Amino acid sequence: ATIEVRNNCPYTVWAASTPIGGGRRLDRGQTWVINAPRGTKMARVWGRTNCNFNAAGRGTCQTGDCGGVLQCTGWGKPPNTLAEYALDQFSGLDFWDISLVDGFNIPMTFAPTNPSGGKCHAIHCTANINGECPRELRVPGGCNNPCTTFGGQQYCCTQGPCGPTFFSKFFKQRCPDAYSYPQDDPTSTFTCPGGSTNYRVIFCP
């Protein structure tokens, strides 16, 4: 129910969170704790780089921009490393993961405060993805997933079943615990007992 977001990067990160939270400027060291009610689904928190917001809370962001606003209401523009979660009330379970399906921009840690059996423990994506990113997927401040760059069933899995590709593997090899393509379920799927824990999202662990 309670997610704590912290920035550890040697640079400022504008945190964002939907459907609850909005956005928050976080200089190195700062924290932002949001409360997510049981029943919150299709939720995600992420970080935006090089934002230039005016005093009215508007402007643009280099990565993860959500329609020119600080208080994010909708999703952000790739590439943006994502902490995805859903606090299901039907099952009493918490389904979460770290996704690279929309690219990578900032390294992070997505961990439950109370870890337990194998599927409910801390996971991270801290490899130097931005520096090794293929020239075909490289953009200012991030690395796009091939589905974004190229589109098509092969990468996006819209027409039917799919498997990993050379480019999804670039991400998977470096961050094995995260979704590298649309149906990377088996190795990117995490679950914790509802209420048995809170969560923490850290940028640049």
Question: Can you give the residue ranges of every domain in the chain?
Answer: 1-205
Q: What's the DSSP call for residue 104?
A: B
Q: How far, in Å, CA of 202 to CA of 185, rounded?
A: 23
Q: Please state the φ and ψ torsions of residue 171, each to the nearest 5 degrees.
A: -75, -45
Geometric angle at alpha carbon 201, from 191 and 113, rounded to 5°: 55
Strand, coil or helix: what is 81? coil
**Check whether domain 1-205 has CATH 2.60.110.10, yes or no:** yes
**Contacts of 189 by beta carbon, 8 Å cutoff, 6+ apart:** 95, 97, 119
Helix (H) or strand (E) holding 140: none
45: Cα within 13 Å, side-chain hemisphere: 31
**Contacts of 152 by beta carbon, 8 Å cutoff, 6+ apart:** none
Helix (H) or strand (E) holding 153: helix 153-156
Q: How far, in Å, CA of 127 to CA of 199, rounded?
A: 22
What resolution, expressed in A, was reported for this entry?
A: 2.3
**Contacts of 131 by beta carbon, 8 Å cutoff, 6+ apart:** none
Q: Please state the φ and ψ torsions of residue 141, each to the nearest 5 degrees.
A: 85, 10
Residue 101 to residues 18, 60, 152, Cα–Cα distance (Å): 17, 22, 14
With contact defined as beta carbons under 8 Å apart, do 63 and 141 qualify? yes
Helix (H) or strand (E) holding 156: helix 153-156
With contact defined as beta carbons under 8 Å apart, do 60 and 107 qualify? no
Residue 164 exposed, middle or buried by CB count within 10 Å (0-12, 13-18, 19+): middle
- Cα 91 to chain centroid, rounded: 23
Method used experimentally? X-ray
